[PDB]
Each structure stands twice: as C-alpha cells, then as structure tokens.
C-alpha cells in the first residue's frame, strides 16, 4: 500500500525559473569574467552541466568568485552554451557552429550530442 507521484513538467519549470533567476540579479553567486564582458550564473547548475567547471568549483570556500576562462573560448561560442545549460535549447547558425563545437569538446558539457554535425547547409 505505497503509491508514487512521478511528474513530467517539474524539471522544465524549475530549470526555466532558475534561468529567470539567472537573468535577474538575485540568488546568483558566481560571475564568469570572459574576454572583458561579464556573465553571471549559479554555482549549482554549472557544477552539473560539465566537468571543467566541476573540477574548479568544488572545495574552494564560499564568497565572491571569478572563474575566468582565460583565452581559449570565444564569446560567440560562449553565449549559447550557458543558454543551453539553463534552458536546454541551443542557437546555432552557419557562422556559429565552429566556436560552439570547440567549446563543447573543451568544457565537456553533457546531454549534448555531436548531432551538430551535418545540420548545416
């Protein structure tokens, strides 16, 4: 006499609300200094989407943070990545594919397949 309650929309709504939080100041507790401009995110999602952030986020004490990606990544290839991390959609164009593909094979972001391979042209 034990019953379950398995939902199928909680994950998407919590991810979208966390993305709204991401776009609105509060509850954001990490800043991604990239190439001069500023990007602000969470210290919980980024330790779940990939392994480069995971290996650099753990252990260190709480507080103000810069986790600057030094030079290798671009910005045109960076903006879609955190959008995919927080919302699970991508924005690819014929002038965007190369840098995004370079970023995925570097940061080792999961739940993204190499299917961004022949969709072009």
């Amino acid at each position: 006499s034990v019953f379950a309650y398995e939902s199928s929309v909680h994950s998407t709504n919590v991810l979208l609300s966390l993305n709204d939080q991401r776009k609105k100041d509060v509850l954001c507790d990490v800043t991604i200094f990239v190439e001069g401009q500023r990007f602000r995110a969470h210290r919980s999602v980024l330790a779940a989407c990939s392994s480069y952030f995971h290996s650099r986020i753990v252990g260190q004490a709480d507080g103000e943070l810069n986790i600057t990606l030094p030079e290798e990544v671009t910005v045109k290839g960076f903006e879609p990545l955190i959008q995919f991390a927080y919302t699970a959609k991508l924005i690819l164009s014929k002038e965007n594919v190369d840098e995004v593909c370079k970023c995925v094979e570097f940061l080792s972001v999961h739940n993204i397949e190499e299917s961004c391979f022949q969709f072009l042209k």
């Binding site: 034990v2 019953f3 379950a4 309650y5 398995e6 939902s7 199928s8 929309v9």
Partner: protein, 327 residues
C-alpha cells in the same frame, strides 16, 4: 467528435437478421463523420447460426464499413451500452440478450490508434521484440492508454499466455484496461483468414500527446449503492475533463443482478450521478485487467506494486476508465 451507434433491447424483431447489423445499416446512412477505426462488441448469441455462420454475421458488418477503415471484432457474454443521441442518456446494463454497440473514431489530429493481434501457437517462441514495435506497444514515447482484450483463455497455457504477453509491454506509464472475452469476429489485417478455434490477445493502443486517462478498481469491498458512489467519487477527483471523453466498464459475470442485492444498472447509474454527460461502453467477461493509476500530460500516479506484477490480474471485480480521446 466521436460518434457511437448501439442496438438496444427494444428492437427484437422476429425476422431473419442480426439486430446490430440492421441498425448499423440504417444509421450509417445518417452518420456525419467518416469512420477511421471502429470497435464493436455484441453478445454471444448473435454470432451463432448452426453451432458457431460466424463469418456471415461478421463479414456482414465488415462489408458496410469503409475499406480503408480499421475494424476490430470482439464478442463478449454481455453488453453494457449508452443509447444514441446526446451524452445524457441513462446507461442500460444488458445481461443475456441481443445487444451491441459500434464506436466510430474519426481522423483526429495528433492521435494515432493502431490495432494489434498476437495469435497463440501450438509450439513456438513467445514474442521476440518486433511485434511490440510493429504496432507500437514499446519504444513509443507517447503510448498512454492500451485496451488489451483476451479470448479463449480456458485452456492451460492460454490462461498463462495472457500472463506472459502483458509483461512484455507493461511497467510503462500507460493504463491497462480490459479482460477476457469469448471469441473474435473480424480484424482488418488483410493477410489472415480468421481462425475461430485459436486464442490470442487483441486490442487498441491509444497514442498521442493529449490523451488523458484514469482508472478505478471496484474490489470486493463495494457491495451497495453508497460504496459504489464512493468509488466513482475518487474518479471525479482526478480532474479529468468532461468533453470528448468516453468511459469503459469491464466487469465479471458474477457481478450484477446476483452480487449487489436484487438491483441492476447500479454501476451505470452511479457513473452518470457524478459525471454529468460522459457516455459509457463496456462488456461483461470472465476476466479483469487494471489497477489504480492516473496518467495525464503532467503527472503519473503508479502503484509501487513491488512484488512482481500482482496488481493487474484481478477476478470478480470491475474496472473503469476515462479515456479523454482528444483535447
């Protein structure tokens, strides 16, 4: 919109011919939608002319319906049906006596229905994998309702055949419903002359993105009017919408006039007591399939049922359903 045609007890004409075939001949002239898949049931005295004859009654209905339409033909010992007209007709529960209904499903966008049939064997394998992918019981991310039926389960092995065949496509987030019936009449597969002596499993496999469902078991704990109404109050709490839904009631031949004291049309009356305009169609059979489970666009309320699968094959009970075909 789904449209239904039925044959009541008030048309027992003393002339040569099936009652249901007569109604389906006259009523199909005034039908408004084009049927695509059809499910029809009739009682087990209107498919016998000499000892079985069966083809004559079966192919008669298999001829009027369109060639492109898909027909599943199932015969049960008892028909429970809502008459024509609107959704407010009082359901009539028919024990032994010529009755039957035909359900006309039109072409609905985004919802796809496909019959399936697994014939039994003298000696062979069970089901390798592909028949569950050929029709769509497995690897289908949108399978939400199935209406498994079974026939000629009397022989040993065949009784356990229904035990084995169900487990292949169970354990998903789907609703099972149905039971055991007498025999089959007509299936539109165009590759097999139907054998009356062979047993198997047949049914519909609803699939879509908006097909909501609901199911309540009626165990041996309900024996009077108030207890039956309490059970169907639980169905109302599922917040299943009213319009474009069809209800099903599969029960046991040991339930009805005999079981609840000297009354009839008791489940049927309680269904429309709390549900104001939904129709009702179901059969009386020698077997029961179902559990307690609600599946909708968002939530699933499975029973943890941690033993193996002992939450499906009940006996001497009744199962309901609230298949919301469409949106």
């Amino acid at each position: 919109s789904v449209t239904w045609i039925s044959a009541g007890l008030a048309e027992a004409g003393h002339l040569e011919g099936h009652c249901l075939v007569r109604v389906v001949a006259e009523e199909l002239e005034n039908v408004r939608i084009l049927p695509h898949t059809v499910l029809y049931m009739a009682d087990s005295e209107t498919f016998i002319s000499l000892e079985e004859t069966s083809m004559e009654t079966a192919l008669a209905l298999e001829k009027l319906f369109p060639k492109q339409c898909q027909v599943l033909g199932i015969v049960t010992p008892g028909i429970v049906v809502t008459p024509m007209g609107s959704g407010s007709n009082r359901p009539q529960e028919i024990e032994i006596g010529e009755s039957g209904f035909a359900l006309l499903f039109p072409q609905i966008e985004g919802i796809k229905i496909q019959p399936f049939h697994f014939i039994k064997d003298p000696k062979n394998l069970t089901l390798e994998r592909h028949q569950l992918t050929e029709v769509g019981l497995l690897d289908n991310p949108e399978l939400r309702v199935v209406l498994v039926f079974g026939y000629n389960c009397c022989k040993v092995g065949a009784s356990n055949y229904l035990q084995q065949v169900v487990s292949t496509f169970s354990d998903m987030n789907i609703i099972l419903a149905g039971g055991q019936v007498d025999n089959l009449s007509s299936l539109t597969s165009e590759k097999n002359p139907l054998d009356i002596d062979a047993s198997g499993v047949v049914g519909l496999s609803f699939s879509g993105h908006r097909i909501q469902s609901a199911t309540v078991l009626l165990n041996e704990d309900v024996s009077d009017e108030k207890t039956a109404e309490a059970a169907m109050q639980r169905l109302k709490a599922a917040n299943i919408p009213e319009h474009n839904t069809i209800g099903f009631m599969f029960a046991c031949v040991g339930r009805g006039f005999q079981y609840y004291r000297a009354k009839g049309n008791v489940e049927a009356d309680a269904f429309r007591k709390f549900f104001p305009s939904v129709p009702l169609f179901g059969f009386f059979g020698n077997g029961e399939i179902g559990c307690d489970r609600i599946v909708t666009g968002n939530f699933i309320l499975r029973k943890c049922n941690e033993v193996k699968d002992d939450d499906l094959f009940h006996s001497y009970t009744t199962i309901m359903a609230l298949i919301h075909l469409g949106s």
